[PDB]
Every structure is written in C-alpha cells, then in structure tokens.
Ligand binder design. Structure first.
Ligand SMILES: C[C@@H](c1ccccc1)P(=O)(O)Oc1ccc2c(CS(=O)(=O)O)cc(=O)oc2c1
Ligand SMILES: [Zn+2]
Length: 94
C-alpha cells in the first residue's frame, strides 16, 4: 500500500494491543497519533476522487471530535468504538 497506509495500519494495531492490555493512557496517546495520519490520508483520497468507506470513517471522525469537545462522553465512546472498527476493516482490504 502507500507508506501512509502502513503507518495507519501499524498505529491501529498498536491501539488494539493497548486496548487488549487495558492501558487506557497508551490508547489515548495512540489515538492522538492516528489523528493526523488519518486526516492526511483521507484528504489524499479526496484529491483523487474519494472512497465511500473512507468517507464513512471520516464522517464518524468528525462526529467524535464534536462529541468529545461537548462532553458527550457516551456518544464519544460509541462512535470511537464503531469508527475504529470500520478503519480496521478498511485497512484489512490490503
Ligand atoms: C479516536 C481518534 C480517531 C482518529 C481517526 C479517525 C477516527 C478516530 P481521534 O478522535 O482523532 O483521537 C483523539 C484526538 C484527540 C484527543 C484528545 C485531545 S482534545 O482534542 O480532546 O483536546 C484527548 C483525548 O482524550 O483523546 C483524544 C483522542
Ligand atoms: Zn481526530
């Protein structure tokens, strides 16, 4: 894949590994690492006409930022879980 796609894949794997161990501080760090990588990747795909599965992920990503900033902690938890799963499945299409 692209180098950026591999960076995202690796970072998703790390988030899953941290989640498995219950290391919530490391999950937070790794989600923050994912943030700029996904943002850049997504806009690259948009510059070449777009992917509906990518668009779906990004829609959820925006909703997550809106929920988190508003303190809507239940909506953040649900949306993060579902969107990170959509991204794992997307990048498993390799
Ligand atoms: C889950 C990630 C994602 C990444 C790509 C797609 C879908 C979800 P994300 O939403 O981008 O990851 C974050 C970002 C920021 C924070 C903050 C800091 S602030 O902006 O809230 O001040 C704090 C925090 O606890 O977690 C974050 C997670
Ligand atoms: Zn983000």
């Amino acid at each position: 894949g692209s180098p950026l796609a591999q960076q995202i894949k690796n970072t998703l794997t790390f988030i899953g590994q941290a989640n498995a161990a219950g290391r919530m501080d490391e999950v937070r760090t790794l989600q923050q690492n994912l943030h700029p990588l996904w943002a850049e990747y997504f806009q690259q795909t948009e510059g070449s006409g777009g992917s509906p599965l990518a668009q779906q992920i990004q829609y959820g990503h925006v909703l997550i930022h809106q929920a988190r900033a508003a303190g809507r902690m239940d909506e953040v938890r649900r949306l993060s879980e579902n969107t990170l799963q959509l991204m794992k499945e997307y990048f498993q299409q390799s």
